[PDB]
DNA sequence: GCTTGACAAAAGTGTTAAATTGTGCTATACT
């Protein structure tokens, strides 16, 4: 056909809807084949291959079982589509809703029990709906939210709508936190989670021709004036340290990790110069009050930021 | 300051992963290829706590008892014997 | 496109006699109904059905309400 | 010139409780 769904509906329509008696039939064949498989599989462990006629028929019981599973599914595909119709427009594509529903249908068939004497559509509707709604919670948001959080976001919505109708207005965070039995600060945190992102490719120019995305600054971009001044600062420190003693500057450089970029502990500096960490603590305080001396500090003042 | 380990994916491809030497080398590494891969050194330490997945047979077993399955199969084969 | 404006007047079920009656002085009115190979009111609704809903096999219940639901409804 | 012991803050580790997160499930009949 012309559309994609019109094409899938054509092929699901080519099967025939079962009545109560058939569903029970297929159900038996499915379970019969499964047990036939598990039994023969049990033989693989201990061997004991069956007689020729008993082996050829067991292989058929299984093939017929799978043919049953496939037929029970192909017959109820219409039921999946009938449920997915109502969940569209909520942020999942119709076909995806259908395919997820079919996943639920598959489990309904696996866990279905024919001895309860209930029509198949009764039990499968539960799984197909849960499969679709569970699916929506894992997918429809660009930034995923876990199921338990998607559960509260929805609840908070209904409370607001129900509360909206009774109050003829929208409820405040306190009314909402009260009706839902939560702290008002939580309902705010929840309302921040429910925000959904926007397209950088939107055109907001509105006879501006531009798109949003190109108005976004790059904050991590290199700033020429800073990097240049930072390079000039790096030189001015090199000089100020020249006034200090070979060991005075040596300790300062290892203390802040100027050369390596890796700072060092008072003990570690004492290990290179062969002294106790305290002695290094002392040499520290002295060279710092030397740096604080206005002669050396006056030049670095303009570098505050 | 790095040691390099090699892993092998199930399909035969091999990948070099540079690590820090002081670190403890993992026995499996998610690889650029997209598959798990196994170290070519001694271990290979662990079973990795496997918990076999749930299967259709399991879901059938927890409702029908094995005896019920036998009779239903008896019904099926006997229907097959009639020709 | 590809439609014989006469064929739809058969889709409503009006017989060809009424076509020569109402058309009257129209020359191409009579000449087109003679050119159209559609025979019957329900068969023209089918020639109109498959081009409007391609890919969907029709039914006497769908083919007739197709025209009524599209406009009259 | 530098070291020693006492000492407290700061930084890591290991152990546990609380929380967060994933998954299975719901049987009037409903195509």
Curated annotation (Swiss-Prot), chain B:
Keywords: Antibiotic resistance, Transcription, Transcription regulation. Induction: Constitutively expressed during growth, increases slightly in stationary phase (at protein level). One of its GO terms (biological process) is response to antibiotic. GO terms for molecular function: bacterial-type RNA polymerase core enzyme binding. It comes from the Bacteria. The keyword Oxidoreductase does not apply. Monomer. Forms a complex with the RNAP catalytic core, specifically with the beta subunit (RpoB); its binding site may overlap with that of Rif. May bind free principal sigma factors. Belongs to the RNA polymerase-binding protein RbpA family. Binds to RNA polymerase (RNAP), probably stimulating transcriptions from principal, but not alternative sigma factor promoters. Partially restores transcription in the presence of rifampicin (Rif) in vitro; overexpression leads to an increase in the Rif tolerance in vivo, with smaller colonies. Seems to act by removing Rif from its binding site and preventing its further binding. No longer stimulates transcription in Rif-resistant RNA polymerase (with mutations in rpoB). This is RNA polymerase-binding protein RbpA. It comes from Mycolicibacterium smegmatis (strain ATCC 700084 / mc(2)155) (Mycobacterium smegmatis).
UniProtKB/Swiss-Prot annotation, chain C:
It comes from the Bacteria. Transmembrane segments: none annotated. DNA-dependent RNA polymerase catalyzes the transcription of DNA into RNA using the four ribonucleoside triphosphates as substrates. This subunit often mutates to generate rifampicin (Rif) resistance. Interaction with RbpA partially restores Rif-inhibited transcription; once the subunit is Rif-resistant however RbpA no longer stimulates transcription. Mutations in the RRDR sequence (residues 423-449) confer rifampicin (Rif) resistance. Rif blocks transcription initiation but not elongation. The RNAP catalytic core consists of 2 alpha, 1 beta, 1 beta' and 1 omega subunit. When a sigma factor is associated with the core the holoenzyme is formed, which can initiate transcription. Interacts with RbpA, which partially restores Rif-inhibited transcription. Belongs to the RNA polymerase beta chain family. This is DNA-directed RNA polymerase subunit beta. It comes from Mycolicibacterium smegmatis (strain ATCC 700084 / mc(2)155). The gene is rpoB.
